[PDB]
Design a protein around this nucleic acid. Structure first.
Lengths: 159, 283, 63, 167
RNA sequence: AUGUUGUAAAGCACUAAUGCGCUGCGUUAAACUUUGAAGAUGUCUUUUAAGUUGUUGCCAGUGGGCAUACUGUGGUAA
RNA sequence: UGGAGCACAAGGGCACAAGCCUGCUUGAGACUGUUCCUAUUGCGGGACUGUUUGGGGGAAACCCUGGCCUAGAGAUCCCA
RNA sequence: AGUUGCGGCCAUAUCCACGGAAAAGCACCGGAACUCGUCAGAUCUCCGAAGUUAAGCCUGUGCGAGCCUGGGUAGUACUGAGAAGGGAGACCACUCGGGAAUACCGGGUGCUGCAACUU
């Protein structure tokens, strides 16, 4: 209700039950590059370099790397339009985003067989996905799997 | 409070990391050690891990990745026995020779041994410079783990030997044997400790006056044929063989797979069911 | 409500409508059923006379 | 099984010259002359009026000795008690102790400038391999097959002095 | 495809409460949480469906609101 | 396993520590730029870089521009 | 097939009781002239190799406490989208959708990386 920087964060900035302690070592060995997608995710045990609570749980795109830090760009809504924001966050509140895993292994195999198709000459680009359709057909059999005879079954009470 | 033997004590317990519960890693020291710039993208840091066990001195050069460290070069104090030394590892002259052998053995793999010749063994504090026209000498940082940093410890003797070999490791002249509190440095007390001017002097002292103590303190020294006067020449003869061929002797024996006879097998599932039911029936 | 099979994940394999009898004749019938009240669910038995099984259910609802 | 012998780990002696000042240095010269090492002083954690102590001053002095030096100090103090101890002075984990009433029974001659002080003796036994819980790297826990117990410590006492267990 | 959340309900693992029997039975929570929805909210792919905007100039009125379906807070209530 | 402490309100955080003892010190240095709360906007309070004929601690990796984090804040005109 | 050095994920790995262990290792272990540090060579620092697998480390066992994963509880509680339904109200019902949680029962009890060494 007052408006200090860490306003109203009793549950948002907390550890999660037998997951206390400082950042582990593999969190310092990741390699970040310009153009990556990243998730912001605050660790409340590290005091330095952390962003404002608005950005906890948002995904952004890297445009610069410092000796201890990153610069991230992303969108914020303010009543009627969007605006670009530039956040400075330390490497301990960030992790790689898996948000493009589906789309990358699909575009990879497409160019794979494209090279394996030009090797044979016969090629074709269009490989759009399709939504799931109506339903195919069924051939249910009763040689085994006898029916079970269900119904309305009068009502009972116990106290 | 809930006390140690109760149910609520275990439901609420959080375990520490496995290398800390064993007492082998200090994790604040490890994080300050492997930190580097997110900018660099040139190559990963190299540390020189020096650990002294109950019977030997180990040296190895490591780099940190996301699923475990990797060893680039390795040297041991038990390899010194093919250069003439068998009279006592884990002493100050063995740590020096183990670090000296890993510096030469690392420069060879990079083809920088014709460059960066071995410095004179008995010089002063001489952190090495980079010669113009060719590659920088590889840079390495010292990592002593949970051993205390005291003036005159064996772990800073392995640091001194890797500098004389031609590596680029930073340090100051403290923690050596000639260092004076004012800030001066006498470079002959460190030469008298690299060679056995400490050991030979002690054997001669307690042999003349009490050979009953001399026979237990230096038992294996006598039965191996080491007499005190020739000690500072056996080391001097080993520091010139290392500087001429420091390479693995290349033996590649085959597998010890017959040792599978020594594991105790687990009861499967039904030897336990029979073991339970029989114990209830006759009860 | 007995198994946990819902309509969005189910299949209808067959649906047949039984036709009325051709010859008409009065007989006696008995109808088991449950019904919902302002405050619960109840059981009842209720005999009657009709000319078919579906005419007998129309007559019990009418009463 | 030479790795299972019991022995004296550490011996503790201390005197409580209650209020610090001049009475301390009389005691501080007793422990030095009796054993041979400079003793250590102790402070009071809180202030109490019923006893008459503040929250920062000296109350007592103590000293810890080991080796074969402590084995013969333990022999002289036991003879003052006729080589006999109450049975209820031994604890669960191989410890026992007793108090000497008057300073001048063990040794050091009168010198009426000092006075007569009381002592307090405490003894700790152990087998080899106790280092695994005191060291720095790979600190651990001892294990029950080691770990001197009460009755293991009683029968150690009737073999080195031929004592007698009262009650 | 891949992230974020601590409400309803429920519960006693922490904080604060509550009756008995001498291990069980009984009762609680806006400023309690071991759990935990329905719903919301980020990013990638039209190389998914269905459909068919960008930049800038000169300017007005308005800044006492009210009702209702569902949903809270204060109040015996309106 | 923290059931204690950590100047002060409450919340969050912390065990070879951020708590206790102890050594040395004046980074509570001089300048310069990007960004967050935060907008149509001043002041203020934080975060992160660079440049130094620059310090302190440490064998070294490494850390340090006040206080473990969220409060302790003052235009135009005039004077020193 | 394992152990040791340095690790990643951080209980299927923790805690309590008993047992096993070929070769190496890892240890415990004998000392104090030098280095270094104490009330104390207990810890820390230096120099060793007589003795021992007793402990630590590693492996087995237990209708073991915990933890991990399933079933039941249950299409229950709660709930998104609707309609001039019932009721004095408190609130209950209907149509198309989504869907939990103790008590109780079953099964599991670390997985992996780089290097050196062992018949």
């Amino acid at each position: 209700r007052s408006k200090g920087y860490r306003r109203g964060t009793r549950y948002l900035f907390s550890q999660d039950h037998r997951k206390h302690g400082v950042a582990h070592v593999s969190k310092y060995l990741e390699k970040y590059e310009i153009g990556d997608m990243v998730d912001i995710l605050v660790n409340p045990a590290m005091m330095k370099g952390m962003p404002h609570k608005y950005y906890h749980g948002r995904t952004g795109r890297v445009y610069d790397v410092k000796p201890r830090s990153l610069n991230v760009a992303l969108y914020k809504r303010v009543r009627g339009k969007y605006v670009i924001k530039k956040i400075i966050v330390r490497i301990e509140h960030v992790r790689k985003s898996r948000c493009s895993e589906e789309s990358q292994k699909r575009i990879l195999m497409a160019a794979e067989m494209a090279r394996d198709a030009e090797s044979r000459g016969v090629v074709l680009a269009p490989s759009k996905r399709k939504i799931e359709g109506p339903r195919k057909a069924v051939e249910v059999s009763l040689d085994n799997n006898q029916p079970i005879e269900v119904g309305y079954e009068p009502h009972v009470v116990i106290f | 409070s809930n006390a140690k033997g109760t149910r609520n004590y275990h439901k609420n317990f959080q375990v520490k990391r496995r290398r800390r519960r064993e007492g082998k890693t200090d994790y604040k020291h490890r994080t300050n050690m492997i930190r580097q710039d997110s900018n660099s993208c040139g190559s990963v840091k190299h540390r020189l891990v020096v650990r002294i066990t109950g019977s030997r001195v180990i040296c190895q050069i490591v780099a940190a990745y996301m699923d475990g460290d990797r060893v680039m070069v390795y040297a041991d104090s038990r390899e010194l026995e093919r250069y003439g030394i068998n009279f006592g590892a884990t002493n100050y002259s063995a740590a020096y020779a183990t670090g000296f052998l890993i510096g030469r053995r690392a420069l060879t793999a990079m083809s920088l041994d014709e460059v960066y010749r071995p410095k004179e063994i008995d010089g002063t504090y001489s952190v090495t410079k980079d010669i113009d026209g060719e590659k920088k000498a590889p840079r390495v940082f010292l990592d002593i783990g949970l051993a205390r940093s005291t003036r005159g410890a064996r772990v800073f003797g392995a640091l001194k030997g890797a500098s004389d070999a031609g590596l680029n490791v930073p340090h100051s002249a403290a923690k050596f044997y000639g260092h004076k509190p004012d800030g001066s440095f006498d470079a002959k007390e460190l030469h008298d400790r690299i060679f056995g001017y400490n050991i030979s002097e002690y054997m001669k002292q307690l042999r003349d006056g009490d050979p009953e103590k001399y026979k237990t303190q230096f038992s294996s020294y006598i039965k191996k044929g080491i007499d005190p006067e020739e000690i500072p020449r056996i080391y001097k003869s080993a520091f010139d063989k290392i500087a001429e061929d420091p390479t693995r002797k290349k033996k590649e024996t085959k597998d010890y797979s017959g040792f599978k006879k020594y594991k105790q097998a687990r009861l499967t599932y039904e030897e336990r069911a029979k073991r339970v039911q029989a114990k209830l029936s006759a009860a | 409500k007995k198994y946990k099979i819902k309509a969005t994940k189910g299949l209808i394999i067959d649906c047949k409508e039984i036709p009325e009898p051709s010859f008409k004749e009065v007989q006696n019938y008995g109808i088991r059923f449950v019904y919902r009240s302002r405050s619960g669910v109840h059981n009842a038995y209720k005999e009657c006379r009709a000319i078919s099984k579906c005419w007998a259910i129309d007559h019990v609802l009418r009463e | 099984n030479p790795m299972r012998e019991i022995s004296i780990k550490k011996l503790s002696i201390h005197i409580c010259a209650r209020e610090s000042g001049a009475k301390l240095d009389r005691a501080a010269k007793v422990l030095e002359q009796l054993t041979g090492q400079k003793p250590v002083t102790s402070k009071a954690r809180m202030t109490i009026r019923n006893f008459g102590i503040r929250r920062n001053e000296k109350i007592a002095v103590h000293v810890n000795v080991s080796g074969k030096k402590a084995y013969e100090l333990l022999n002289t103090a036991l003879r003052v008690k006729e080589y006999e101890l109450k049975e209820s002075c031994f604890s669960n984990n191989g410890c026992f102790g007793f108090g000497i009433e008057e300073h001048i029974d063990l040794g050091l001659k009168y010198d009426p400038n000092i006075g007569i002080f009381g002592m307090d003796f405490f003894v700790i036994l152990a087998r080899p391999g106790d280092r695994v819980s005191k060291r720095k790297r790979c600190k651990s826990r001892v294990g029950n097959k080691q770990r001197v117990y009460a009755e293991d410590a009683k029968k150690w006492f009737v073999e080195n002095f031929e004592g007698v267990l009262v009650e």
